[PDB]
Amino acid sequence: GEEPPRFIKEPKDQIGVSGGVASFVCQATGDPKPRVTWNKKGKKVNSQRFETIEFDESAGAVLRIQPLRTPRDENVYECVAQNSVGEITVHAKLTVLREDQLPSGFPNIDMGPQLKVVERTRTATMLCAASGNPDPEITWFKDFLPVDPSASNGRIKQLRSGALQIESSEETDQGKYECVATNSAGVRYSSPANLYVRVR
Ligand SMILES: [Cl-]
Numbered sequence: 633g634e635e636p637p638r639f640i641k642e643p644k645d646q647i648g649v650s651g652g653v654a655s656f657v658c659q660a661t662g663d664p665k666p667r668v669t670w671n672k673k674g675k676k677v678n679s680q681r682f683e684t685i686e687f688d689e690s691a692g693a694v695l696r697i698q699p700l701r702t703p704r705d706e707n708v709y710e711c712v713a714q715n716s717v718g719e720i721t722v723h724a725k726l727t728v729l730r731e732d733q734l735p736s737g738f739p740n741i742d743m744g745p746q747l748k749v750v751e752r753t754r755t756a757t758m759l760c761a762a763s764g765n766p767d768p769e770i771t772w773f774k775d776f777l778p779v780d781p782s783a784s785n786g787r788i789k790q791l792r793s794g795a796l797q798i799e800s801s802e803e804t805d806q807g808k809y810e811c812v813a814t815n816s817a818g819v820r821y822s823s824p825a826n827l828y829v830r831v832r
């Protein structure tokens with residue numbers, strides 16, 4: 633009844649903007665079920681601008697850096713997965729550009745999401761118009777954690793337009809949403825938008 637840890641979600645190198653945000657996502661499995669931790673050069677990652685959000689019983693961890701500082705935050709970071717029969721490591725590098733030195737094709741948020749208010753049970757759609765070259769792929773974060781529409785059992789859909797849609801809004805859907813535009817050139821976060829649900 634034992635299996636060493638293995639990464640099922642590995643963090644990727646990122647290129648962010650000064651003042652913006654970067655989130656590295658790391659997740660592992662194994663038996664016993666492992667914990668994952670974020671470190672830098674062996675030391676635990678934890679400061680005012682560096683927060684970790686654990687999920688999946690701590691077998692998952694998001695490292696959110698905000699606001700980004702250059703060149704302070706330009707480093708390699710480590711996600712360490714550990715259980716009783718193994719400890720493994722994956723690396724993710726962070727690059728931080730000044731707004732001044734952004735390449736022309738760097739993702740830009742033409743129109744980010746706004747404060748959303750919706751009557752419980754009704755559909756709420758939050759828009760995100762992003763530009764870039766290549767055309768950025770759009771993802772969303774809720775309360776610092778990545779949203780996964782496909783794993784939402786149909787409660788949440790990402791539209792072809794990049795918009796996030798809640799099919800039948802419940803109180804649980806309230807929170808702080810951010811859209812993220814990512815391409816070969818780097819990553820840019822929209823300003824956050826809160827979603828509030830009002831009584832039916
Ligand atoms: Cl919107």
Ligand code: NA
Nearest residue numbers: 643644656657
């Ligand atoms: Na990542």
